[PDB]
Amino acid sequence: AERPTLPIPDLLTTDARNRIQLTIGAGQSTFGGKTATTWGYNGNLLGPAVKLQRGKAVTVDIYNQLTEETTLHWHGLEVPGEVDGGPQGIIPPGGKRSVTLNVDQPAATCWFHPHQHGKTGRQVAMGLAGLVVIEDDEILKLMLPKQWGIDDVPVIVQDKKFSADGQIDYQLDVMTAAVGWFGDTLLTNGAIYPQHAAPRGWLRLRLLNGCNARSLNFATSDNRPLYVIASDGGLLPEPVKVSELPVLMGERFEVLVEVNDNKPFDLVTLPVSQMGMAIAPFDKPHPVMRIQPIAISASGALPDTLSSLPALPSLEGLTVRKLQLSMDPMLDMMGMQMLMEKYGDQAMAGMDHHMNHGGKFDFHHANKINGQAFDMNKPMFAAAKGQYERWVISGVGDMMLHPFHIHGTQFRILSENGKPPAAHRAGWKDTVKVEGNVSEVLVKFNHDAPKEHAYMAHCHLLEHEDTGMMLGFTVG
Ligand SMILES: [Cu+2]
Ligand SMILES: [Cu+2]
Ligand SMILES: [Cu+2]
Ligand SMILES: [Cu+2]
């Protein structure tokens, strides 16, 4: 049979009352011909793309039609803690919460997802994620590819696994608390290996790694390059040509790729050096989507310059914050042993060369920052507002992958896991790799966050977050 077409999320803008309505609910999806219960925003799975303009406010009405509590966080958006939608932003089942977002950051592809305390990994795995497209006056002047669903398309890449009855097989247990929840089935905007028909010329892909725990590495099947034009927080100063593009959980990149008549090619993901993630079929390059060229000219441009990136400021005298990530050694050892027992040596491919003892030994609070599993009631510190700070995040002590994300900001990486950042990672980012080493970022918070609606800083391997690798912090 033919491949399904790539689903395109609807691009949603405000009504005359300046409102956007988002309903959170459960329904059914089909994978490989089997029904599964799934959750979506304005539908059964995934969500729309909310379109925002710098310097304009919009109000979002969010209706929770699940039978459990949830929250809605705008990952990548710089907004006050009161509307950030972290764990304290509870929407009761059957209830509604509204937030007004005063957009004040450059054009970028952001996203939105639940942040329910202890349950973010399950709620994302069940289907909840959406996109945010921020525009400003500067980006439209570039005449980039801009026809949504034609030559400007979002690509949300996620894995799942399913039980024999067809349902999503999600579990937060000792194994996934150590290495993450991952599966054997790859979805692209919710579909299995779709095709996208694109006009001749440049195709813009807005890539999101929406996996709970799997890192990805994008490339093309015939080795045509990808031109990175933007990272998590917006445009790079000029395009950066790459042959492969690693993308950590929750990160976005926008790339341009050439489309030529008569030569279909796949976007693929290459095997990564992360524990568990190279089990067949991910031990080999894995298709993400087929690009099918159409003999109609695409009008978008790849300009030589995209934007102005300010210099880093002097670092001397800035507040230096230390964030030590850690995992309980026993539960790290127990979860890695269960991974190895299940899959064998292949669970470490590509890597470098039982009784109840009480609540003190519960894996649900085994992962930590600065010696503490996440305490919703006690922000760990008060950061300055309007001031640059150097945050130093260490994963020394274990070898798991921790894509570390800080709410309320777009930062600049100074060191990524002990090395200067790659050029396409040197601009605006909201995630930094931490893996067995130390990262340092330059952050500034433009908005307040009080104790009651604090900002989060956390590993975005969701099963680590949910078992304690998160802290709250206030601003102002
Ligand atoms: Cu996120
Ligand atoms: Cu976030
Ligand atoms: Cu982690
Ligand atoms: Cu978050």
C-alpha 74 – ligand 2 centre gap (Å):
6
Return the structure tokens found at 450.
């009080």
Provide CB contacts within 8 A for 43, sequence distance 6+. Answer: 27
* Phi-psi map region of 67: left, alpha, beta (phi>0 left; psi -120 to 50 alpha): alpha
Residue 115 marked as a ligand binder: yes
Peptide bond into 281 cis (omega under 30): yes
Residue 154, phi then psi, degrees to nearest 5: -80, 145
Question: How many angstroms is it from 143 CA to the middle of ligand 1?
Answer: 29
User: Whose atoms come closest to the Cα of 76: which ligand?
Assistant: 2
* 254 vs 435: CA distance, rounded Å: 24
The residues with which 205 forms a beta bridge, in sequence order, are 153, 255
The experimental method is X-ray
Beta-strand relationship, 245-247 and 130-135: unpaired
What is the DSSP-derived secondary structure letter of residue 162? B
For strand 470-475 and strand 381-383, is the pairing parallel, antiparallel, or unpaired?
A: parallel
- Residues 191, 287: Cα–Cα separation, whole Å: 12
Calculate how far, in angstroms, residue 467's C-alpha sits from the geometric centre of ligand 3. 10
Cβ(109)–Cβ(136) under 8 Å?
A: no
CA of 6 to the centre of ligand 3 (A): 31
Say how many Å lie between the CA of residue 176 and the centre of ligand 1: 18
Q: What's the CA gap between 250 and 275, in Å, rounded?
A: 18
The alpha carbon of 291 and the centre of ligand 1 are apart by a number of angstroms equal to: 28
Burial of 129 (0-12, 13-18, 19+ CB in 10 A): buried
Structure-token pair, residue 125 = 């795995």
Which residues line ion ligand 1, judged by CB < 5 Å? 75, 250
Q: In this structure, are strands 57-64 and 96-102 parallel, antiparallel, or unpaired? A: antiparallel
Q: Which one, of 202, 146, 168, 194, lies nearest residue 44 by Cα?
A: 168
Per CATH, domain 147-298 is 3.90.1010.10: no
* Residue 459 known to bind ligand: yes
DSSP state of 314: P
CA nearest to 23, candidates 70, 58, 57, 81: 70
Q: Which of 291, 294, 234, 237 is nearest to 104 (CA)?
A: 234
User: For residue 42, how many other CB atoms are within 10 A of its CB?
Assistant: 18
211 marked as binding residue: no
d(CA 229, CA 470): 30
Q: Report whether 122 contacts 170 (CB < 8 A).
A: yes
The annotation status of 464 as a binding-site residue, yes or no, is yes
- Measured in residues, the chain has a length of 476
DSSP codes joined into one string, 280-310: TTTTS-EEEEEEEEEEEE------S----PP
Contact (Cβ atoms closer than 8 angstroms) between residue 225 and residue 244: no
Cβ distance 73 to 394 under 8 Å? no
Any known ligand binding at 117? no
E strand or H helix at 465, and its extent?
helix 462-466
Nearest ligand to residue 71 Cα: 4
Distance CA 310, CA 237 (A): 9
Q: Which ligand is nearest to the CA of 368?
A: 3
The closest alpha carbon to 400, from 376, 366, 429, 361, belongs to: 366
3-class DSSP assignment, residue 241: strand
Q: How far is the CA of 150 from the centre of ligand 4 (A)?
A: 30
The Å distance, Cα 460 to ligand 1 centre, comes to: 7
Distance 113 CA to ligand 1 centre (A): 6
Span from the CA of 248 to the centroid of ligand 3 (angstroms): 11
**What are 381's strand-pairing partners?**
473
Q: Return d(Cα 250, Cα 401) in angstroms, integer.
A: 13
Query: With contact defined as beta carbons under 8 Å apart, do 18 and 57 qualify?
Result: yes
Domain locations in the chain as residue ranges: 1-146, 147-298, 317-476
Question: How far is 136 from 133, CA to CA, in rounded Å?
Answer: 10
- The CA–CA distances, whole Å, from 144 to 71, 105, 152, 256, 260 equal 34, 19, 9, 9, 18
Ligand 3 centroid to residue 226 C-alpha, Å: 28
d(CA 389, CA 384): 8
Task: Compute the distance from residue 470 Cα to the ligand 4 centre, in Å.
Answer: 9
Asked if the peptide bond before residue 237 counts as cis, ω within 30 degrees of 0, the response is no
Distance 464 CA to ligand 3 centre (A): 5
Q: Are strands 320-327 and 389-394 parallel, antiparallel or unpaired?
A: parallel
Give the ligand at the shortest distance from the Cα of 461.
Answer: 3
The CATH code of the domain at 317-476 is 2.60.40.420
Task: Say if residues 301 and 144 touch (Cβ distance below 8 Å).
Answer: yes
Fold match between domain 1-146 and domain 317-476:
yes
Ligand 1 centroid–CA 308 distance in Å is 26
Phi, psi of 74, deg, nearest 5: -100, 90
**73 assigned to a ligand binding site:** yes
CATH topology of domain 1-146: Immunoglobulin-like (2.60.40)
Q: In 3-state terms, what secondary structure has residue 371?
A: coil
Q: In a 3-state reduction of DSSP, which class is residue 33?
A: coil
DSSP for 438-457, please give it: EEEEEE---S-B-GGGPEEE
Nearest ligand, CA of residue 366?
3
Under DSSP, the state recorded for 386 is S
Check: CB of residue 80 under 8 Å from CB of residue 129.
Answer: no
Q: Compute the distance from residue 258 Cα to the ligand 2 centre, in Å.
A: 32
Strand spans (E) along 161-209: 185-188, 195-209
**How far is the centre of ligand 2, averaged over its atoms, from the C-alpha of 112 (Å)?**
8
* β-strand pairing of 438-443 with 320-327: unpaired
- Tokens encoding 246: 């690693």
Residue 354 labelled as part of a binding site: no
What is the gyration radius of the CA atoms in the chain, in angstroms? 21
- For 415, which DSSP code? E
